């Protein structure tokens, strides 16, 4: 997107609001499939709320973008190749923009809490450059995301419940390998409103469910090879203390001559189901994670859609 120049990245909106533009510093991708990252310290130290996001991406080159909040970006640079790392600490994903799947807006009254004593101090943007035909000009790119911040406390706080595998091993040639994840929910109620799935090339399908009284309620189901944007949930789903969140990624070993385990490269795999939710401000926590399988046997009753591609 157009580089800002002399006006800088901060646009005052009114007494308590401002837009912060998070753009690449005029970079020029040299290889296709390049992944660039950069970070912006928040301008204010006190707590603020991110209530909106507007993509500022060049359609001819940018394939996808992801925006995280964290306290220690992986590089002190102007920008860097993300394969070096995103954040030293555990990054919280806030937004994903996919070229072929237009992002959905946050419900009004819902905001991510950042800054202050416990909120993220930085935003780290990762841009994935696919086609670079437009880059023979050796033109620089300032694609990114604009974020709307406010000091006004929001009634509903947005958070992320991340379900991910750590132990998965996919034997070469192996027709079907399931990665099951399950945890019991023990916090105040959350209402899922969006979900994103993430797998590398071996993933066939990823599904997540809320299981209450043995009954399975679909949160989201998606083919991880389709654009990995946050998609709105079919129907609002609350998860309450006692419920169990269960997820399954279906992989294959077909095509691999060696075993594939969980990891950060293209030769590795990942099984992630991001569940974006909102909670009443007075009960809210911004992030939860599940990296276990507490009810392995429970999957004997998983809906068949969980094994059939989409
Ligand atoms: C090892 C793995 O599966 N990593 C995933 C999930 C992940 C993401 C964030 I944000 C975290 O803070 C943590 I802890 C783990 C991963 O990096 N996925 C990237 C993606 O979703 O595209
Ligand atoms: C005064 C105000 O809030 N104006 C905009 C907010 C805004 C402005 C810019 I410049 C941004 O880049 C972003 I992110 C958000 C407003 O009312 N936007 C409505 C909307 O499109 O959602
Ligand atoms: Cu991409
Ligand atoms: Cu990955
Ligand atoms: Ni409800």
Short key terms for the protein model shown above:
ten-stranded mixed beta sheet, five-stranded antiparallel beta sheet, globular, binds N-alpha-acetyl-3,5-diiodotyrosylglycine, binds copper (II) ion, binds nickel (II) ion, oxidoreductase
What would you note in describing this structure?
The protein is mainly β and 310 residues long. The protein has two domains: 1-158, Jelly Rolls, CATH 2.60.120; 159-309, Jelly Rolls. It is built from no helices and 21 strands. Strands 1, 2, 4, 8, 10, 11, 14, 17, 20 and 21 form a ten-stranded mixed β-sheet that branches. Strand 15 (203-212) and strand 16 form a beta hairpin. The chain is globular and about 60 Å long. 39% of the residues are buried. The chain binds N-alpha-acetyl-3,5-diiodotyrosylglycine (2 copies), copper (II) ion (2 copies) and nickel (II) ion. Residues 63-64, 128 line the site of one copper (II) ion (CU). It is classed as oxidoreductase.
Outline of the structure:
With 310 residues, the chain is mostly beta strands. 0% of the residues lie in helices and 47% in strands.
